Amino acid sequence: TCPFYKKIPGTGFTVDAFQYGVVEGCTAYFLTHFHSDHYAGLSKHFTFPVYCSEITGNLLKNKLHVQEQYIHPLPLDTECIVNGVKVVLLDANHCPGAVMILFYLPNGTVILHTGDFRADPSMERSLLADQKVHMLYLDTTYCSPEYTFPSQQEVIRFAINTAFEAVTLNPHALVVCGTYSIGKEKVFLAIADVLGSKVGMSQEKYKTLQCLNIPEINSLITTDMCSSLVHLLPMMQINFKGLQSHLKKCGGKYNQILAFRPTGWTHSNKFTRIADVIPQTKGNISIYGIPYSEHSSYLEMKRFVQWLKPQKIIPTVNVGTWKSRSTMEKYFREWKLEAGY
Ligand SMILES: Oc1c(F)cc(F)cc1-c1cc[nH]n1
Ligand SMILES: Oc1c(F)cc(F)cc1-c1cc[nH]n1
Ligand SMILES: Oc1c(F)cc(F)cc1-c1cc[nH]n1
Ligand code: NI
């Protein structure tokens, strides 16, 4: 059964609620983004209205085969009326097509649902600047002060410089990047661009990237592996055995692999700085774990919430244990007392 934190009270709306069968009284199902834990349950047999971004709608149509008649794409930054209720979609700074949703309830209450997001000061000059938000449904993935990591720009600078140095020293080196979902496309696109290469990948991954429908990505991707010196593989293959196996298939074209595993936060962030990061190495294979996050750091989250000044916060991540729930509630109270309430 559908949990309380996925229902929007005083409406017929749910958010990211496709794995619970027919939800009683739900007239419209919102989907914040195309990640599997959020879309779980959608297929060609779904017959209720789905509201989402254009990019999310492209993925629903082509990857999950949802019928066109049930897909309702909405433009960003635009007041829209859905089943008698004013809504706005805002960029979430997560993966491609990811949104936050502002709901203007009939009773005068205003709700912001962040979906998954990476909070940024630029959100302080969105349509959020205008008015009061009563309730915030918050992506609390990294809601603890130990969760630190660098900016996306700093991580990409490291990856570009590392890859360019390696291939300039050894023109016969291959670069490999791991993936298991949409998001983090900058890692492989930025490396390919500096090396003057397209990114080679499976037909299935090519299809997914096409669905994003953006010319710059299309110009840098191919299914012809032999023509490319940056290859994408499933994240599960980014290990010494998997990479050894892959190098055999390349027909003596390469004699070294440099590989990148984009992760989220890992405990090595507590000790090491991005500039001091070193790889795991075995013979002619090296693997770098790089902390490229598409979720807010603790400090980014705190800044956003202290700016927004919501009356109530409902966490949507780490909700399963009493320890997690208690810890998050203590941070929200600290932030409030500091902020002057
Ligand atoms: O995600 C992107 C990326 F990684 C590289 C790029 F050039 C463009 C995008 C993008 C996202 C939405 N519109 N365009
Ligand atoms: O955390 C808050 C903050 F930083 C500023 C603010 F105005 C309110 C809160 C809050 C916490 C729980 N309910 N409201
Ligand atoms: O363990 C707990 C529990 F069972 C119930 C509860 F409300 C809180 C906790 C907890 C643990 C650490 N901090 N808070
Ligand atoms: Ni996500």
Side-chain angles (χ1 to χ4, degrees), residues 185-186 188-194 196-201 206 209-210 214-223 228 230 232:
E185 288 77 13
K186 272 295 276 202
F188 55 84
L189 296 173
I191 292 165
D193 173 77
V194 76
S197 182
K198 294 191 185 193
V199 182
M201 62 192 70
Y206 186 86
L209 299 184
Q210 290 286 148
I214 177 261
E216 287 71 45
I217 298 179
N218 290 347
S219 74
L220 300 193
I221 64 171
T222 187
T223 56
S228 165
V230 182
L232 303 194

Side-chain angles (χ1 to χ4, degrees), residues 132-144:
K132 192 174 176 61
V133 172
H134 297 81
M135 308 195 75
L136 176 64
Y137 288 68
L138 181 63
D139 169 16
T140 44
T141 295
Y142 295 128
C143 187
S144 192

Side-chain angles (χ1 to χ4, degrees), residues 48-203 205-240 242-247 249-269 271-281 283-309:
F48 295 96
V50 180
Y51 289 83
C52 59
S53 68
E54 177 176 346
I55 287 165
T56 299
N58 294 344
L59 293 154
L60 294 185
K61 183 189 179 173
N62 290 287
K63 296 292 291 196
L64 304 182
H65 304 297
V66 174
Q67 296 170 52
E68 192 133 66
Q69 72 181 136
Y70 305 113
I71 302 166
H72 294 258
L74 304 174
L76 301 188
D77 301 325
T78 303
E79 294 180 349
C80 300
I81 309 302
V82 175
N83 298 352
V85 179
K86 180 162 71 170
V87 306
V88 173
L89 304 188
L90 302 165
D91 200 278
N93 190 40
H94 184 55
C95 65
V99 301
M100 316 191 287
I101 312 158
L102 262 183
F103 300 95
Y104 293 81
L105 270 45
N107 74 358
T109 303
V110 179
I111 297 167
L112 178 65
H113 199 303
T114 66
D116 282 349
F117 86 140
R118 185 161 182 179
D120 192 78
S122 62
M123 297 170 176
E124 305 170 20
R125 296 168 285 281
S126 66
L127 307 209
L128 294 178
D130 294 58
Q131 84 292 271
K132 192 174 176 61
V133 172
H134 297 81
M135 308 195 75
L136 176 64
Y137 288 68
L138 181 63
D139 169 16
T140 44
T141 295
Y142 295 128
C143 187
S144 192
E146 76 271 20
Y147 298 122
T148 65
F149 36 73
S151 69
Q152 293 174 168
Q153 190 270 328
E154 287 172 280
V155 173
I156 293 301
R157 177 90 285 194
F158 175 80
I160 290 168
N161 291 356
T162 299
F164 182 85
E165 167 155 314
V167 176
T168 306
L169 291 171
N170 182 196
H172 301 274
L174 176 64
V175 180
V176 180
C177 295
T179 186
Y180 46 33
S181 61
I182 65 166
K184 313 193 182 186
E185 288 77 13
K186 272 295 276 202
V187 178
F188 55 84
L189 296 173
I191 292 165
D193 173 77
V194 76
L195 297 178
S197 182
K198 294 191 185 193
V199 182
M201 62 192 70
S202 68
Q203 292 185 258
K205 188 69 190 181
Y206 186 86
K207 182 177 183 188
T208 302
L209 299 184
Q210 290 286 148
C211 290
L212 311 187
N213 195 28
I214 177 261
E216 287 71 45
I217 298 179
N218 290 347
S219 74
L220 300 193
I221 64 171
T222 187
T223 56
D224 183 9
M225 306 302 298
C226 297
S227 66
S228 165
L229 62 140
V230 182
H231 296 174
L232 303 194
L233 294 178
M235 200 74 80
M236 293 176 82
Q237 190 148 23
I238 312 302
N239 47 67
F240 295 122
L243 294 165
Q244 277 169 206
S245 181
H246 185 71
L247 193 62
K249 298 157 195 149
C250 294
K253 201 166 174 288
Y254 309 106
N255 63 6
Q256 185 184 351
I257 287 172
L258 163 63
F260 295 93
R261 288 192 317 94
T263 63
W265 174 91
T266 73
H267 175 64
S268 56
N269 279 277
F271 305 124
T272 315
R273 281 180 141 72
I274 188 64
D276 302 324
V277 166
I278 59 161
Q280 298 176 249
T281 299
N284 63 342
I285 305 173
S286 292
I287 307 177
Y288 286 88
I290 61 174
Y292 191 95
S293 180
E294 294 188 336
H295 297 273
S296 313
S297 72
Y298 175 86
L299 290 169
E300 290 161 357
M301 190 188 303
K302 180 176 177 283
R303 178 182 169 119
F304 178 78
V305 173
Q306 289 183 313
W307 173 81
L308 189 71
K309 303 179 162 64

